[PDB]
Amino acid sequence: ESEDLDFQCESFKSQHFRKKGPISQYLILGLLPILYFGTEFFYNHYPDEDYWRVAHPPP
Amino acid sequence: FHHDKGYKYDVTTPYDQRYNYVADRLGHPEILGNPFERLMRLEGDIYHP
Amino acid sequence: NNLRLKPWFHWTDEERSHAIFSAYEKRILKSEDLPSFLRANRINNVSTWVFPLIALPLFNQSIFKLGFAQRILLTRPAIEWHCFKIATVAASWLAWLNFSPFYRKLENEKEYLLDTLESRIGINVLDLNDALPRWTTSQEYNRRTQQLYNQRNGFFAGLLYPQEESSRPLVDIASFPKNLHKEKLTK
């Protein structure tokens, strides 16, 4: 910054090529629907606490 | 030379060989800044090294 | 009973001093309750701005002649010796300010005045507290109380300063009209 000119190099090797990387991030992505639904319903306890619990009649 | 952006005809003119300022004799203290704007840590385009 | 929380169990020193000052100003506390507390207050002031003086030669005879102090004096520049002496005196001064017998006496006198207030107006002693200015101190409120005592219990009372005896009209506050309405604005 402040000492590199804002210009474009003549060579094509200055192109920003995309290369792949790690895969654990995509492990997180693959379970995204499971994690999102679990977060909402269980973590936020929606609609209420007793809905997802195993059903018991009152004494 | 800059092997990724530059050419072999990249020779910096040394500060000795650059043309001296002769247009006027009065000084131009803008290039120093001010004690006020140095104290205030203000960055100006006219005193940027 | 030492298990009952007094209404001012959370108040700071500034809040306690302001409560006492407001009680005296509002003629809840008479000038007959102040002379002890005020006296303690003055002693506390003398206990604050004299201690470093009292602590300056004493250390020169007790602490600054010790082995560690002499080592600092002999093997370090004079500015570091001054720094050591000033730091020691300032630490002693801070410890004195936090734990001073005269400060404890002043706090006890303020507690006695607050107990008298609670005996007089009951739980309404909490009505003497407000949102104090940030930089006004307990000493400043004590000085204001002392100034009010000097004004009332001295000359010019009734000439330049209001007297200590109230002359408020005798009315029935249950029926007498009030300035503020409960919910709306009135004219």
Added chain:
Amino acid sequence: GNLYTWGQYASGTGFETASAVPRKVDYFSGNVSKVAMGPYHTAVITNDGSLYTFGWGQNGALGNGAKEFQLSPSPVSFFNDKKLKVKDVVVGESYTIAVTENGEVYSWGYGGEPSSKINLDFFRNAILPQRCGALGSGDNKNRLTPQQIANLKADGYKNISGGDNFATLVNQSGEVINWGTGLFGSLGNGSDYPLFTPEVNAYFKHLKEHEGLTVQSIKSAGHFSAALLSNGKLYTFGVNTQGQLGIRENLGHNTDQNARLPTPVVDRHFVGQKVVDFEVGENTLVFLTDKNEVFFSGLELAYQPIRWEIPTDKKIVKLAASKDTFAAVTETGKIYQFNEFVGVSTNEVGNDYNVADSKAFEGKVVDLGGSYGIRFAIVN
């Protein structure tokens, strides 16, 4: 000549009260030959080879078998009793080393022994290397009385100098023998481990073998050292607290914290010149180059050697460096000083120097020295 001492404090000054103005040590009747001042104690060798140590005798220094202050000058009973004349002396933070005329080397002082049995040596030794001193004993044990360094002969040696916790001997053949604490490249040998016993420096041996550069001299102060080699170059190594090393190419880069190996100073400001001599003080390095030019680094002002602008009309004879001060003595005895080195200055001032008043000393200032807060002048 008569001794003159001054400084910020009164530990190693030979007196009991400090004085900025020079004060004449006259316990010696003009027989002072050499003086070595550490941070807190001083050792003086007279004409007859007698050794007098004074100052703070912590960790068994001063060669008196105690750990108390001895502000007044006092002879060392180990050498005076046997009439063993001492040739040279090196004084460091809490140690003393004496080179006698027969070549034997003695040491006494702090050696790295832990102060108390209750200490955090577990975590520290898990983190930092084991503590050591400038003794050649081979163990971290304090020497309250002078004791010979086994298997070390200093006869015909070019130089001997030591820092706060390390020592170095440069022989006539250019061989460098180091011992003490080598942490952060103080010894310049490329290792941070302590050297309890003296060992030959491998880096300078490699330089003399391959590059063919012979070590002219080595001078140390604090945890910093500078070496002058066969070519007119200075190689600094140690802890760069305040820019003493003079190895910073770019003023704005704070990456020069320490140099494990001897790195050459930045030759930018004296291209084509060869260093004639140099002097090392606790936070400063002042060297004179053959164009009669004085360059300095340190004091948190110059992180690379920049020229001192004292007049070059008169040849510079002596150089001296000390904590936040330094000075240069010319042929005529005129003493230029950066900051108050002598303590008295005349009205003659210049862009970066004052002139020390000649009235402070009674005679001609033959020698100047002192690198940690207390300074001395040997005056004839």
Added chain:
Amino acid sequence: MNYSYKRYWEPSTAEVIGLSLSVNTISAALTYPIEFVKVRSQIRTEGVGIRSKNLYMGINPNKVFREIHATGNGLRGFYQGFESHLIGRLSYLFIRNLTYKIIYDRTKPVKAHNDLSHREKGVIAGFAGGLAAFLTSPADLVNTRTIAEGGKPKEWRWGYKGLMDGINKIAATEGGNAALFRGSYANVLRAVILNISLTGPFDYLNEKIWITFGDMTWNKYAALLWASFWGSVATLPFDNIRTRLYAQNADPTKNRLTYSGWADAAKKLIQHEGISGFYVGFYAFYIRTFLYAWTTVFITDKITSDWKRKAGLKEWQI
């Protein structure tokens, strides 16, 4: 949650000692080949580290198992040093359980529905585990040396034929009883970390699952899986350093690396392997932890519930 505890039946010292010894003998006998594979995986990557990339990072437990089986000793070759492992584990458990029981009985709350917070029980368990691991370090050392040899050159092997034989050889050759306690501080650190990394995570997820899904039956096993994962994450670096210190030969020549202590071992692990070099054999360590914990919890719960039902406790108190 401080009223939520259920301690209406407290087992006696004899009961806890006998049950712990028997159940943990079974558990250790079941997972000893997994421990063997983990130790071998840690041994084979001392100066190397993890050199694969992406999903291949680490050492495959099945590959090590196949190599050890192809050695030619069969499954009995995975139980070499099991005498040392079992004796050390049983002694460690005896000392730890005795000290924990004593300090707990001196400190446990009066009410049967109250109990020490996980920090207090963690302090007690850490002290007990540190003491027991310090005392059983010779047995752990002999076991680790027995396992490690085989993945080492012939001249680097110790050749131990038992626990007493190994102890005699260590004392006689290396010299003194201080030789038996090589790397004992590593074992102490490992036991301190292991004794505090399982109770915390287990109760956390168990209670959270109960809050979410009510009183189902899978709650404790999901919480056990989670606790095993976090205990393996916390304990594995210390186990790795303990393995490195235990397997180091007395002769500095016969070592890929020489360690002068726990800190030195950690430094030389970070230098050559990096941070990820700590977690080698993580799958094996986690699987062994989960299997051992599941076996112990299952059998102990069955036995203690049977004991409680014979003590007259109601169903909600069991």
Added chain:
Amino acid sequence: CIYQAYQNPLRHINTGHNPNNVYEDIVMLGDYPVQ
């Protein structure tokens, strides 16, 4: 720039546009170029 000096402080008014531990301003807090 942590432990590595990429930027050139000789060509910047204020070094500290990025979190770093290896840069120092040439014109420091108390420095004022004057005529």
Added chain:
Amino acid sequence: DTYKKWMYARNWDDFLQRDCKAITFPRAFALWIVGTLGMATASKWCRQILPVGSHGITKISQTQFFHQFGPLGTLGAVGFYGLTAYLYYKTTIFTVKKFYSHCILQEREWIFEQERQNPGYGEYFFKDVPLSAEEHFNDLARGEMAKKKFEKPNHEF
């Protein structure tokens, strides 16, 4: 309100306890670490802007800051350092008090502990615990805790 206060923090102890919510000891120590970093940075800034005792300088006059701005700049730097040191001392006292209370005396922020014990939707209403719920607090305790009476003040003013 008469706008005599804006932050409504009586002192720095109140600020740290309530505004920053350093109710526990780890929070107090984290705030102390932040304050230590800030104090070190402020000291370094003051020593850089007024370099007395750094390069052999011994007098305030022999600094470029004094040449440019004079005694007003020195007063400003002294005030800045004094305020920073005052706030750091207050933070240190707060942290030491919290360490003595929570770690030595084993005191806690008990409402915070109650919130820690129940994670919002737990089922911990038990008959054995009188304080578990409002239904399980026995009526005898309610009667007994309210037996005494307040004193009637004497309106002697």
Added chain:
Amino acid sequence: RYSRNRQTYRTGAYWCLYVNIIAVVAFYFWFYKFTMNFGYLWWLLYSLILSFFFSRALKHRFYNPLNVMTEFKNGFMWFIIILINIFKPLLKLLENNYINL
């Protein structure tokens, strides 16, 4: 035919973050009368507080405890020097008063 265009918009990214904060916070406060309890996740609040002092202390390597101790000592000595040099003119004025008398 268009001049070179800068390839980053940092002020734009932060202006949009502020727009999101304004929308959510203002709408919750106006309609739900809700204000987020920043003390619930106190360590995010600490990260906000820490960030104001982290970088400047990082520049001087104050993450090292030794540097902090050295800086404390040097700063206190600097403060003492300034105060002493302030109060010595009182002694100078006293001597001037003696000579004036």
Added chain:
Amino acid sequence: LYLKSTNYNRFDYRLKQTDWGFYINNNSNYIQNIFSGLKYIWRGLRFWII
């Protein structure tokens, strides 16, 4: 106050360590232009006070 005071300041040595040809080192006494920073501070805040 500046009887025996040298011309150079810290910034002068810092400048001598840089390749900034546009700035030079002061060679005369600063008594003539002393306390000019206050003048520049006034000029900076001149239109902002009211």
Added chain:
Amino acid sequence: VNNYFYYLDRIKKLFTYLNDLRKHILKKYVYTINHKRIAINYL
């Protein structure tokens, strides 16, 4: 060179790598105006 802080050098490289990666991520995905990265963030 028998430096005593080789592990420390590795940790220093890790810290430098983390700061460089932070700057890279911010400049490439958050502060960018490239339409492809913005579209992928949208997705």
